[PDB]
From Swiss-Prot:
Outcome of substituting H116 to D/N/Q: Reduced activity
Outcome when changing H61W: Impaired activity, rescued by 4-methylimidazole (4-MI). Impaired activity, not rescued by 4-methylimidazole (4-MI)
Result, substituting W2A: Impaired activity, not rescued by 4-methylimidazole (4-MI)
Name of the protein described by the UniProt record: Carbonic anhydrase 2
Complexes and interactors: Interacts with SLC4A4. Interaction with SLC4A7 regulates SLC4A7 transporter activity. Interacts with SLC26A6 isoform 4 (via C-terminus cytoplasmic domain).
Keyword Cell membrane in annotation: yes
UniProt lineage: Eukaryota, Metazoa, Chordata, Craniata, Vertebrata
Organism: Homo sapiens (Human)
Source organism superkingdom: Eukaryota
Amino acid sequence: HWGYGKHNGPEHWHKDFPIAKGERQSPVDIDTHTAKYDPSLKPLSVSYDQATSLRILNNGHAFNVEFDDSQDKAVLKGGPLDGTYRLIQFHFHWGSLDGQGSEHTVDKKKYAAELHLVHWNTKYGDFGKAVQQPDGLAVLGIFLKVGSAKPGLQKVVDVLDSIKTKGKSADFTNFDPRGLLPESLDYWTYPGSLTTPPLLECVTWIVLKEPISVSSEQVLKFRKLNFNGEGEPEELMVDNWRPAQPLKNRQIKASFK
Ligand SMILES: CCCCCNS(=O)(=O)c1cc(S(N)(=O)=O)ccc1C(=O)O
Ligand SMILES: [Zn+2]
């Protein structure tokens, strides 16, 4: 099945998922000099005070921190978006070393990791319906650089030993995702896709300009996870990022001058 290795990696995905070569694929390189300030864009509205985290899952490609999305509790609104998008999960993409790991790049710069907070449009009623629509998802992307520790990340880092291998999960309640945000909510935005199979073209991407800083020790613990299941040959979960895809007929808009 699909993954990130030599034999089943991003360059192979098109054989099972032909949309891999589509017109609005993600991630992309963000050319900062070409991205145009759009004064009609709004400030993002990130309302996470009532977020209910439930569980953390190693799914064989990343780990997902899952939320209760049965009611409007944690929502993303404003910015480029019409209507209300409900938080369902967040996960990361990261590298084997600090010089790579992000999916989006900024003037070809790769960050050490990238956080994705995935939200679905509540006019479609459920997540499975939303991913079938061009405006079904809004993903908030946040770059990670290595420097000072992120205190709000450590609860995630410390549970990782209990979900080492694919299919393991652990209870993960009362985690506050506001602890993973940078100071500024300045962002770039463009229409795109899921960055993993099935690569559906259902995502409004909102990528924050300001990275968060995490410690070397924090990201090293991400790199001790396993793609494999329990007892199988150990394959470290590293370099679970899709490289930048052709921008094609798309404009990246900036929220800031
Ligand atoms: C039902 C088919 C849709 C699968 C997409 N699920 S997701 O939760 O939106 C998601 C988004 C992304 S991403 N990088 O935001 O496109 C990565 C993984 C997953 C996942 O399945 O865990
Ligand atoms: Zn992702």
